[PDB]
């Protein structure tokens, strides 16, 4: 089998992403952001707080006719962002894009944490890390892909997300089309249950490359590029005028600045993110001061390849017995 979805942009800076799940039977479509740095597949519900649903569209399990209460299961989860939810499981029928996994774990929310309330456009995550780091307690469940996997005809997904615009997760096979070149893989470690892998160096605008190892994890459900702050510092140091503040929480620039690409290696091969996918506009309203989208991981103890990075490659997740990563330009 496999499976084909388009994946929205919720906003105008790509904040996240958003594709639509059926879940139940009938279908109840919820539109949820896909996470390769997470392993729960959770949704805004019927039992949540429902001061803390605000315009998301949420799962009623008591309607669908193959949900069942997975007795005795809860899960409670915190994100790197410092968000969180927790309620209760249910098992039910999810289809991505045509392919449908039964018995799938789906968590329902009894609480959100205000960022998600706030976020209208995201009725809940779909997590595609390993499922070591599913957190329903007793039992740890399984993601969708690794339920699916044995069905697929490859076991691998793919990530092809917009600049500005839509793209796509296939589940099954590689799209030959939707790439330019070849694909390079790189080896992964599953040993904190994330996509982690090394890139070999990088390069800003047409500088030279610098071969250097930075150990990160591709990351669907993080915005930006958080590295190293030596890397980051010498990004910035070619952006007049940009500076880290510590008020705002990073690194600014002039909105009336050009900026950069950034080019990071993937073994011998090179994904280049051109400069503007690195704006991602005023810190508020009317604001000239700019927020970039390269910032540093020192405060976050791994370096992660968020959308920044990704929507500048074709990426296949390899979920075979050795998993691997495969990136080309696009």
């Given amino acids: 089998s496999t499976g084909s979805a388009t994946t929205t942009p919720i906003?105008?800076?790509?904040?996240?992403?958003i594709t639509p799940v059926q879940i139940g039977t009938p279908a109840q479509t919820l539109?949820?952001?896909?996470?390769?740095?997470?392993?729960?597949?959770?949704?805004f519900s019927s039992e949540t707080t429902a001061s803390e649903v605000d315009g998301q569209t949420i799962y009623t399990p008591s309607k669908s006719t193959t949900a069942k209460l997975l007795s005795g299961a809860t899960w409670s989860i915190?994100?790197?962002?410092?968000?969180?939810?927790?309620?209760?499981?249910?098992?039910?029928t999810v289809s991505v894009g045509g392919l449908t996994v039964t018995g799938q774990a789906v968590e329902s929310a009894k609480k959100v944490s205000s960022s998600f309330t706030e976020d209208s456009t995201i009725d809940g995550l779909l997590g595609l890390a390993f499922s070591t780091l599913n957190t329903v307690s007793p039992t740890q469940q399984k993601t969708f892909f690794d339920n699916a996997k044995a069905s697929?005809?490859?076991?691998?997904?793919?990530?092809?997300?917009?600049?500005?615009?839509?793209?796509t997760y296939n589940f099954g096979f590689?799209?030959?089309?939707?790439?330019?070149?070849?694909?390079?893989?790189?080896?992964?470690?599953?040993?904190?249950?994330?996509?982690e892998w090394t890139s070999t160096g990088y390069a800003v605008g047409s500088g030279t490359f610098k071969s250097?190892?930075?150990?990160?994890?591709?990351?669907?459900?993080?915005?930006?590029?958080?590295?190293?702050?030596?890397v980051?510092?010498?990004?910035?140091?070619?952006?007049?005028?940009?500076?880290?503040?510590?008020?705002?929480?990073?690194?600014?620039?002039?909105?009336?600045?050009?900026?950069?690409?950034?080019?990071?290696?993937?073994?011998?091969?090179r994904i280049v993110i051109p400069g503007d996918y690195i704006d991602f506009g005023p810190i508020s309203t009317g604001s000239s001061s700019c927020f970039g989208g390269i910032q540093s991981s020192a405060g976050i103890g791994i370096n992660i390849?968020?959308?920044?990075?990704?929507?500048?490659a074709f990426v296949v997740f390899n979920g075979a017995t050795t998993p691997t990563l495969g990136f080309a330009s696009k």
Wanted: glycine fraction near 12%.
């Fill in 11 to 17: 906003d105008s800076l790509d904040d996240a992403y």
């Fill in 31 to 43: 539109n949820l952001d896909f996470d390769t740095g997470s392993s729960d597949l959770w949704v």
């Fill in 78 to 92: 915190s994100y790197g962002d410092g968000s969180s939810s927790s309620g209760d499981v249910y098992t039910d």
């Fill in 152 to 167: 697929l005809d490859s076991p691998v997904f793919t990530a092809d997300l917009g600049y500005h615009a839509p793209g």
């Fill in 174 to 195: 590689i799209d030959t089309t939707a790439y330019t070149g070849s694909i390079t893989y790189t080896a992964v470690s599953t040993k904190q249950g994330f996509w």
């Fill in 212 to 230: 250097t190892s930075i150990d990160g994890i591709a990351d669907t459900g993080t915005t930006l590029l958080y590295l190293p702050a030596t």
């Fill in 232 to 269: 980051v510092s010498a990004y910035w140091a070619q952006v007049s005028g940009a500076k880290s503040s510590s008020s705002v929480g990073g690194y600014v620039f002039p909105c009336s600045a050009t900026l950069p690409s950034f080019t990071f290696g993937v073994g011998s091969a």
């Fill in 305 to 312: 390849f968020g959308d920044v990075a990704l929507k500048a």
